[PDB]
Amino acid sequence: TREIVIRDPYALRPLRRLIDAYAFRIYGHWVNRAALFENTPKAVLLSL
């Protein structure tokens, strides 16, 4: 429902699978394949 896409698109599974697949279609020429994934906010990232 729209509210879920606005709030947390990723958790909802069906949509995430779509998001991850779209990430690859666009960017799998750059491919652990994890580079195309960002689950850390850059702060916990740039923490070390």
């Binding site: 896409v5 960017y27 580079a35």
Partner: protein, 970 residues
């Protein structure tokens, strides 16, 4: 043979006589299209005589008695009469062949229609859109085939070779098409149809291989698509199959046939192309053109032509088959006069039944209209029947073995002769181990530059009696300058183009020459489909030696040693003396060559020049623009010392200077129109300047060298050192598309300015420096070093900040995802259009663009990819695809043109709030001085809870919330 095979042959004789030969004019031999259309089309006449030629061949393979000889002779001479009549139709227009030879304009083309009673012209040039390279090419192809089958002045031979030059440049010539209406929109717009290109390739092969393989490049790039404004044309069967067989890729032929079957084939034939509307009940019969808004109307109700199923029987006979389903499905023939099949031209959805057919595709019982019988289709029907019933063989209709195109051709071994320019050079080459022969020793074989070869062909085809002036000066690529030539009984070998072209900085770099040689060898190993083995003459000049002169360049040695080893350039190479290569070479014989501030007074300001060589040059633009070929008052002019400066910096090889001097002296690459024509030959558009849109002038069609060069100059807006970069990068892209075209997949509009900017950025982060000092060190790159940068740009090879770099690399290369354009077609059905930077991609485009067109692609890439910044664009690309992603779950449609940038930005404002809270430095987020998008957003990965595409999903949902008040999502 008269027991049970002569009676059926006589039955087919009655068929051809009562359908085709009854209408042949005894004066001219031409065939009128129908009772209403009394004119004679070139292509229709050529195709309609195929049944007569096949019958004559049948009759002859069994001609022993007189009567049978009489019938065979009558049929063969009817074919000869028709072709001769078409010849005098073309011969009367020798002034048009000559004019089209140099200026390939639609107003200077051979007419398609001719008066069937006088071989004259019926309508004016302006009145039919006469440019149809396929008609002239099919005429030439079947003239070659009929002659090779035994069917017989030199003046008409000269005319035929001038026609070879006429159809020679068909890979870069816009056409009105096989359907003589240009593009689908139907506004008389000349367009490049693969049908014409393939037919021209077949005609040239049957009858210079450089333009042949240029046509081959067009075919590979365009297929399975027909042209720019056509997803698929059923006329492509005339290229991937009988009669051209111009595609040697079996997979490509199968894919084109499958596309035709899946998209155009219906219950009553195959539609010519999607949204054709030639005889649909929705068109205006008395209106010649088509408004862009009525092309939708033609969808799913296009007229199905039985003519194309004759092509599907012909292939199936040419290639053995149980496609006896294409036959037995042609029960849709008019009369069972007496019982004559009378193959119709097309079937149209009955008018009342438009809605049912639209909705339920290929299902309504259509009516036959148009020509009856379609003689072009009827002749192919009779020929296919003949061939299928055993009265004919593929080898009789095709004595030139055009059918054997699809067979894999083995790699060719390019014999190369390395020739020393001088004997000292030969001595150096030997100290290093390459045993060669000097150009003097190779006598009586005479080595000449490729310019001489191009000039020699200008004397081929000349009869001044009918005012025909040879062949236009065309640059001979590696393919042309790889055969040996027998000119006046002495063998002439010609060095490749890239050696004699020493007028731009590319030739000074020996690595460049190595790279050009490698590209030429890679092109040769793949594109040589000629009798003989190709021979590249590679003379080692004095410029190819090192600084001392007692040693050879390392790069040139290494290349020569690899060639001696058999492999260089993806090609197997045999090196040896040129004398050994005579017996196994394409020794073609050229028989036409046989004889028979303050103080504005610039009085004394150049006195400062009389040693840094940079400053000496710098002053020289003040003294050029302010004071270029003007005097210096020391027996010297501004141009002279700039040339002296150019030579000095070439000797010192400080490449920044050479480039600048070249830039202010307006040095231009001679084979640059070839580079642009090659890049456009592969269905890739080009844009030439820095990225804001007006400067970046797009190149949609080939351009002559003067225009191309002039377009480059005005795209720099006077800012020097990019106008040379445009040419150099264009050349490099041409070489890389000739050698590694996979690198150029998912790329359709090469932005040279964005490419240059991304090379500067890469030189800034690799060999870390300022972006500016890097923009200046990009000048100081060797031409081969810059080509390497471009390779690495394309392939994405590396020598927390990564994702910004990628977003930049892909955006500058204008790389789109696979299926991206078709996905954009899908959202345009939902929304009323997309808006990027205020420019609108309206949904009305889909009403005249089928999703798979390379004309809709261009429409999209002109509204989206125009974005200056490299990354903003790649984000706008994501926001479109997340719009595509969420359009499926969304069940409704919105009446707004969606502004993608906002979705990008709304995601931007959603990037500050989330990252600040998860808790990140406020200064960690930095806005862009060009796009206003946080740098960390670019650095973010696509997927994830904090991925950039997820933010756009949280943005598009928060964007269409006010447009779509309610969203019953799936």
């Amino acid at each position: 043979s008269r027991s049970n095979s002569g009676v059926r042959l006589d039955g087919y004789a009655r068929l051809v006589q009562q359908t085709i030969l009854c209408h042949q004019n005894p004066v001219t031999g031409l065939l009128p299209a129908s009772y209403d259309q009394k004119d004679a089309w070139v292509r229709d006449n050529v195709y309609s005589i195929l049944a007569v030629w096949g019958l004559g061949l049948a009759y002859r393979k069994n001609a022993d008695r007189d009567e049978d000889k009489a019938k065979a002779y009558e049929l063969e001479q009817s074919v000869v009469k028709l072709m001769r009549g078409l010849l005098h139709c073309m011969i009367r227009q020798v002034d048009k062949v000559e004019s089209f030879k140099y200026s390939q304009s639609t107003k200077d083309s051979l007419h398609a229609k001719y008066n069937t009673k006088t071989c004259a012209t019926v309508v004016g040039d302006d009145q039919w859109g006469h440019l149809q390279l396929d008609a002239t090419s099919v005429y030439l192809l079947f003239l070659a085939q009929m002659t090779a089958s035994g069917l017989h002045s030199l003046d008409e031979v000269n005319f035929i070779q001038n026609l070879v030059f006429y159809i020679e440049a068909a890979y870069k010539t816009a056409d009105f098409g096989i359907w003589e209406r240009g593009d689908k929109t139907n506004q008389g717009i000349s367009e490049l149809n693969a049908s014409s290109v393939g037919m021209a390739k077949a005609a040239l092969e049957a009858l210079l291989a450089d333009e042949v393989q240029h046509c081959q490049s067009i075919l590979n790039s365009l297929l399975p698509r027909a042209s720019t404004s056509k997803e698929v044309d059923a006329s492509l069967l005339s290229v991937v199959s009988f009669p051209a067989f111009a595609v040697e890729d079996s997979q490509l032929v199968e894919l084109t046939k499958q596309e035709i079957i899946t998209k155009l084939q219906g219950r009553y034939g195959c539609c010519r192309f999607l949204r054709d509307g030639y005889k649909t009940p929705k068109e205006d019969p008395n209106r010649l053109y088509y408004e862009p808004a009525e092309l939708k109307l033609f969808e799913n109700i296009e007229c199905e032509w039985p003519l194309f199923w004759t092509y599907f029987i012909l292939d199936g006979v040419f290639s053995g088959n149980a496609e006896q389903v294409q036959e037995y499905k042609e029960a849709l023939e008019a009369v069972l006069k007496n019982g004559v099949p009378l193959l119709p031209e097309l079937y149209s959805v009955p008018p009342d039944r438009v809605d049912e057919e639209y909705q339920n595709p290929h299902t309504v019982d259509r009516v036959p209209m148009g020509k009856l019988p379609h003689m072009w289709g009827q002749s192919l029907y009779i020929l296919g029947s003949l061939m299928a019933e055993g009265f004919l063989a593929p080898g009789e209709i095709d004595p030139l073995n055009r059918r054997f195109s699809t067979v894999p051709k083995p790699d060719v071994v390019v014999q190369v002769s390395i020739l020393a320019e001088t004997e000292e050079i030969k001595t150096i080459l030997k100290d290093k181990g390459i045993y060669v022969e000097t150009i003097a020793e190779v006598y009586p074989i005479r080595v000449q530059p490729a310019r001489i070869l191009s000039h020699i062909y200008s004397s081929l085809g000349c009869n001044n009696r009918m005012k025909l002036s040879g062949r236009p000066y065309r640059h001979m690529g590696v393919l042309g300058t790889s055969k040996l030539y027998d000119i006046r009984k002495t063998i002439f070998t010609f060095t490749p183009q890239f050696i004699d072209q020493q007028q731009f900085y590319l030739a000074l770099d020996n690595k460049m020459i190595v790279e050009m040689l490698r590209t030429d060898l890679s092109y040769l190993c793949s594109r040589w489909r000629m009798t003989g083995q190709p021979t590249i003459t590679f003379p080692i000049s004095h410029s190819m030696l090192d600084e001392d002169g007692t040693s050879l360049n390392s790069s040139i040695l290494a290349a020569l040693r690899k060639m001696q080893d058999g492999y260089f350039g993806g090609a197997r190479v045999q090196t040896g003396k040129l004398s050994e290569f005579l017996t196994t070479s394409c020794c073609t014989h050229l028989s036409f060559m046989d004889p028979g501030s303050g103080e504005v007074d610039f009085k004394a300001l150049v006195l400062q020049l009389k040693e840094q060589a940079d400053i000496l040059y710098m002053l020289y633009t003040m003294k050029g623009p302010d004071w270029t070929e003007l005097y210096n008052e020391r027996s010297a002019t501004v141009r002279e010392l700039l040339t002296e400066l150019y030579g000095k910096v070439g000797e010192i090889r400080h490449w920044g200077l050479i480039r600048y001097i070249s830039g202010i002296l307006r040095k231009k690459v001679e084979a640059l129109d070839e580079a642009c024509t090659d890049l456009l030959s592969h269905q890739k558009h080009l844009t030439v300047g820095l990225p804001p849109e007006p400067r970046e002038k797009t190149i949609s069609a080939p351009l002559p060298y003067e225009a191309l060069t002039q377009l480059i100059d005005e795209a720099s807006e006077g800012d020097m050192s990019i106008s040379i970069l445009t040419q150099e990068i264009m050349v490099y892209l041409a070489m890389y598309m000739r050698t590694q075209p996979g690198l150029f997949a998912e790329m359709f509009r090469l932005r040279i300015g964005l490419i240059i900017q991304v090379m500067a950025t890469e030189l800034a982060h690799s060999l870390r420096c300022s972006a500016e000092e890097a923009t200046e060190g990009l000048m100081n790159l060797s031409p081969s070093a810059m080509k390497n940068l471009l390779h690495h740009i394309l392939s994405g090879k590396e020598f927390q900040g990564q994702w910004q770099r990628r977003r930049r690399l892909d955006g500058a290369l204008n790389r789109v995802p696979v299926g991206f354009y078709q996905k954009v077609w899908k959202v345009l059905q939902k929304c009323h259009g997309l808006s990027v930077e205020g420019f609108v991609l309206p949904s009305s485009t889909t009403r005249e663009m089928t999703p798979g067109e390379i004309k809709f692609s261009v429409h999209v890439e002109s509204v989206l990819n125009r974005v200056p910044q490299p990354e903003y664009r790649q984000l706008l690309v994501e926001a479109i695809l997340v719009l595509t992603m969420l359009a499926d779950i969304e069940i409704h449609s919105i009446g707004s043109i969606i502004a993608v940038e906002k979705i990008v930005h709304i995601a931007n404002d959603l990037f500050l709030q989330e990252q600040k809270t998860l808790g990140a430095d406020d200064t960690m987020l930095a806005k862009d001085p060009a796009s206003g998008i946080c740098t960390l957003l670019y650095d973010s990965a696509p997927s994830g809870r904090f991925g950039t595409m997820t933010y756009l999903s949280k943005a598009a949902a928060t964007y269409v919330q006010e447009f779509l008040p309610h969203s019953i999502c799936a």
